[PDB]
Write a structure and sequence with these properties.
This is part of a larger assembly, with one chain. This protein has about 50 residues and is largely without helices or strands. It binds one DNA strand of 94 nucleotides through loops. This is DNA-directed RNA polymerase subunit alpha.
DNA sequence: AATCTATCACCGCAAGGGATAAATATCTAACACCGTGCGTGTTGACTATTTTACCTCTGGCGGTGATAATGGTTGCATGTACTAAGGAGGTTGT
């Protein structure tokens, strides 16, 4: 599961093709997800975003 | 190894800061003069440069004293821990 398996739900370049995520094994297998992405320029903890 | 779109940004290209070099004006230094005085020259009399001679220093070193003096000094090698060797000699054994 790879960059060649993405779809662009927004404005996103991808200078990370080699970032393989996971795998599948059968001729009828599947997996799907959404992903949220951000740029900003500073840091906050995942469970101290607070408001 | 070529293609570019789409990053994070350098260029795209306006502004303005310091710089340095021109001209001026000041500084000092380099010099040319002058004057001083010293180390320019020969000569001469001095006195003590050196030599040798003489008369008489310093220090070379050889020589050995006598009322008599006639049993001496010397202090700590080391105190432990080992144990291998030689030394002893009587004897109960080879």
């Amino acid at each position: 599961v790879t960059a060649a398996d993405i779809t662009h739900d927004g404005d996103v370049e991808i200078v990370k093709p080699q970032h393989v995520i996971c795998h599948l094994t059968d001729e009828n297998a599947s997996i799907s997800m959404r992903i949220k992405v951000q740029r900003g320029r500073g840091y906050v903890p995942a469970s101290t975003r607070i408001h």
